[PDB]
Write a protein that binds this ligand. Structure first.
Ligand SMILES: [Hg+2]
Ligand SMILES: [Hg+2]
Ligand SMILES: [Hg+2]
Ligand SMILES: [Tl+]
Ligand SMILES: [Tl+]
Ligand SMILES: [Tl+]
Ligand SMILES: [Tl+]
Ligand SMILES: [Tl+]
Ligand SMILES: [Tl+]
Lengths: 408, 413, 413
């Protein structure tokens, strides 16, 4: 009934208190049997949409970047985001190694530590990106095959919208229209769930605090910190550089963006903030014909915010499970995540949904008590992380639409 | 060789002829020969039905959620929705009441494999509730999870509507398309049922032929037991609730029926809420309901009218369970029944929805249709579904008019 | 750039590949190829058996809708009857030529070091009842061919009946679902084109292995296949088309003289759709009514079954024969008739001949994962390119043959 972000922070701050004192001389168990299931309900509602959004999303996403259905002003802004995600990934990993979130918290939940099962011959792991039956991939949660098929579909659809046959061209138009809309419904459903999130988020940390000790809160602050420093380090180290390098003034640029960022910071919605963003791009004096096209893109294809979230969440999730992870695997894991997140920029809680999808793609079964309880930690603090996530997404959309505006 | 012939006649001929053939082949006949030869024609029939059980429940619920969905729901609409909810309320109670009043099922104690069916029971409440949320909705759909499919089709249908309330025309057209295509699938699945009802006379023949030949003559009384339980609760609904609702709204019940008289008799003989809808609207005009009212509210009851199904399930549930051996309590009765009705929204008619829902409710309550008992128990009701489905639709239509008349008179604007 | 003529690419990959393979076979390292080269071929085979499900399904829904009565126009009904009575003959030639050359025996593959063993086969009741999908989403989800076929027809036909409805809500909904299912189908074809781009690499790796490992025997066994097709192929044009034209007072000699490049385009483009512009312009040169060829040509592009019928005839026989199992005339057609009867809507489509094979094997229970089945299919898939040129060339010749026969019955020459 009331401001949804307030609700989640209230449930979090209140929940960690309740959990923590109930932890000390309380009954970690009673929480586990009674409180926690409300939390589990929450985590179920999210993992639910993990499949439809990943697939429907990527079909739309592929079609968005798809050549040469891609316009010429478009091709440049795409090139922009690729070379920004580039840096946004490096920062992610760097900050994730810089703060070491996860080690320190050594979860062995069943009273047995989680043991990563590994891993078939390169041949078989590559071959198996190609879904043997795409309905089946989709049906029983194969991530890599769904990704591969949703790109190969999305790109194909666009080629059909370049056909002589209007029977053909309308058909494609229809399919894609319908796949979108599914995607679009899946998002509306996230909004709905975020409504339950304050109860759900409550129940989650309540348990984690009551059961994992007080150590966690420092481990989570470890996460939050690693994101937010990388986050501002992105704006400063890359955006300001790109603006400066294009004769735009970084200081006064921020002065216009100032509330467009603050809106994103508080609405979490790249789409919800889009009205405010476009109005500021007009204040900055970007061509109408430019920002009305390139801003609607960053709202969806902006990959840089998610790239920073995954960088850290990946590393913490894995680190806490026990498995110390190398730089190679870090990006392999991360690049995969970001490369499937295209089309999902905001979307309220995308950062967390992608995490689920990446774990399900790297084989870690969410049903295993450790994986679950590890994930459940980040899912608690997702709210906070998701504010910076969107805020940087928006800042980099303007930065891009401004750089590309100027070249026209 | 054209079966261009009245399809209801066909099924009743298939039924009354079939039970004779079966019954005499039973007495000094060869229950077995029937079982190996005649029955598979019956099983083909039961397959064609349980086929559509998944697409129609899903695609149907998406459309139905979207139809009741707020605030996409118009204000004339919101009152008629409230109507059907408080009528299904009563329709359910009568269902259970009549199902306990006649005791269909006990008396017939089927142990078909030569072993009695044994309900397997049941995970911790936590786990049964959590598992209503599909972990992967494609998967729910793919391998038949009922409760997760229900849950997802509602959460989808509602969401779609909210998208048709968007600024973004990209978004608004997208939603419109998806929902358009989900409908139409629903709509096609219905057209497929009509097709199957065409085979129903042969299939319904082979089904009771076996049941009679093998289950004794006890069945025909047990089935009359069902038919009765429905038809008495059925008319007891019209009298006890509709007439009270009309009387309570200054509408005259006696003269109301006098207009509805053929509109009901059409439904009773067409089994189709949609097929009868033309006749119904013309009678709503005879009763002098506003054009802008009945041309909206009647197309809804044709789909969302839940009261007829509520009575079918009430009795079929109790019989199917009772015959299996398991004596069922009043809590479970409605738990089971409310479930069924609440997923049957959007499926009013549809020729044989009564039977389809039964199959879906069983698959939802864990009873595997592959087990010989559950199968041979369902195969009984599926025979007589035809008869029951005439009263089902007739009451559906009577209560659509009752509703659209009660709501009409609260307007006149 | 791999943008160079795609057919050249594949023949270069084939002729080069067989050399490389074969010499690497003799004193080479059949094994090295197996571990390193072959996986590139396997990636190819995967990419194909990938789309086998969506195309069969989405394709048959479209196909059903295209022949569906009485949505079928009257000029249409005669052309449909034409292709049915030509597929009739095309099947017989298929089998005849497959028996006449004996492709397969001579190559006795036992790959694991154990020969493949056809597992057989449930009671006729169970194999027939199981054509009806218990849950159609599941059929689709886990590869069930026969159920997918059955449901895709029963859906496509139904959708068309809905486009004959009074209710525009209904008639648009159907129009949408069918529109969307199309496009999916249409996308799946675009995806094949994409794969054929990788085909030169993939095809190289496939025969490279087969030659290196299966001996030099194969090339003769494959020439055996190519021949059987191409002789049956031309024997179709001569024995049936020319007889049909002659029988309708059209002159076969001068008919060919117009079709001459329209066939040569098809022979070189492999696409019934790609060649369709050329075809229509030639139908105009032959002086067919504009309103006739602009309708009937677009059909044979998709429903022409006669080319595929000849491919399956021979591929079936070889594939089974090589596995070890000697196959009778009954089974031959049972297997083949099935294949052709699901292939409606898939005329071209670049590599449909091979995709249908995979689908017929998955329908007849032979698991593509078994190393023999796999290595046997992997042989035809190599030479598919060659076969597929004659496939489309005969498809086109017979579309013209039909549209000219049907044209003249309207008195539109
Ligand atoms: Hg998840
Ligand atoms: Hg069923
Ligand atoms: Hg295959
Ligand atoms: Tl994105
Ligand atoms: Tl976000
Ligand atoms: Tl209903
Ligand atoms: Tl009915
Ligand atoms: Tl075809
Ligand atoms: Tl072809």
């Amino acid at each position: 009934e009331y401001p949804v972000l307030q609700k989640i922070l209230i449930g979090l701050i209140l929940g960690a208190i309740v959990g923590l004192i109930l932890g000390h001389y309380g009954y970690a168990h009673a929480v586990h049997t009674y409180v926690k299931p409300f939390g589990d309900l929450f985590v179920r509602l999210l993992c639910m949409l993990v499949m439809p959004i990943v697939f429907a999303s990527l079909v739309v996403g592929a079609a968005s970047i798809s050549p040469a259905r891609l316009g010429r002003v478009g091709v440049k802004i795409v090139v922009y985001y690729l070379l920004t995600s580039a840096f946004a990934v490096t920062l992610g990993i760097i900050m994730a190694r810089l703060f070491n979130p996860g080690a320190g918290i050594h979860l062995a939940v069943g009273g047995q530590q989680f043991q990563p099962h590994q891993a078939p011959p390169l041949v078989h792991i590559l071959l198996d990106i190609v879904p043997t039956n795409p309905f089946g991939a989709l049906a029983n949660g194969q991530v890599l095959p769904t990704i591969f098929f949703a790109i190969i579909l999305g790109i194909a659809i666009t080629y059909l919208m370049n056909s002589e046959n209007e029977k053909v061209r309308k058909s494609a138009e229809t399919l894609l229209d319908a796949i979108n809309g599914l995607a679009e419904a899946m998002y509306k459903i996230v909004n709905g769930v975020m409504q339950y999130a304050p109860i759900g988020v409550f129940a989650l940390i309540a348990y984690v605090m009551a059961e994992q000790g007080v150590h966690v809160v420092g481990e989570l602050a470890k996460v939050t910190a690693a994101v937010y420093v990388g986050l501002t380090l992105q704006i400063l180290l890359v955006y300001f550089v790109l603006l400066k390098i294009y004769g735009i003034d970084p200081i006064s640029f921020i002065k216009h963006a100032k509330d467009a960022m603050l809106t994103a910071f508080v609405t979490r919605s790249s789409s919800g903030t889009l009205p405010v963003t476009m109005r500021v791009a007009k204040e900055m004096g970007i061509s109408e014909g430019i920002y009305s096209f390139t801003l609607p893109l960053g709202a969806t294809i902006n990959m840089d915010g998610t790239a920073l979230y995954q960088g850290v969440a990946t590393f913490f999730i894995a680190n806490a499970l026990g498995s110390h992870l190398t730089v190679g695997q870090q990006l392999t894991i991360v690049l995969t995540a970001v490369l499937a997140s295209i089309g999902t920029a905001g979307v309220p809680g995308a950062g967390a949904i992608m995490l689920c999808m990446v774990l399900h793609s790297v084989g870690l079964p969410l049903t295993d008590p450790n994986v679950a309880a590890a994930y459940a930690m980040i899912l608690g603090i997702d709210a906070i992380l998701d504010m910076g996530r969107t805020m940087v997404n928006v800042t980099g959309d303007l930065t891009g639409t401004a750089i590309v505006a100027k070249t026209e």
